Amino acid sequence: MLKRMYARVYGLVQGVGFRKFVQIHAIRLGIKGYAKNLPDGSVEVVAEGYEEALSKLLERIKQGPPAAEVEKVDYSFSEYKGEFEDFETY
Collapsing DSSP states into helix, strand and coil, what is residue 28? helix
**Footprint of Na ion on residues 4-63 (CB under 5 A)?**
8
Active site residue 19: yes
Active site residue 4: no
Taking the complex as a whole, how short is the minimal distance between the CB of residue 20 and Cl ion, in angstroms? Answer: 5
Q: Which does 74 bind (CB under 5 to 8 A by kind): Na ion, Cl ion, none?
A: Na ion
Using alpha carbons, select from 80, 85, 74 the residue that is nearest to residue 51. 80
Q: Report, in this order, helix, strand and coil percent for the chain, each rounded to 5.
A: 25, 45, 30
CA torsion angle 48 50 51 54 (round to 10)? -50
Catalytic residue, chosen from 4, 19, 28, 60, is 19
Q: Which of 1, 66, 78, 90 contacts Cl ion by CB under 5 A?
A: 78
Residues near Na ion (CB under 5 A), total? 2
Residues with catalytic annotation? 19, 37
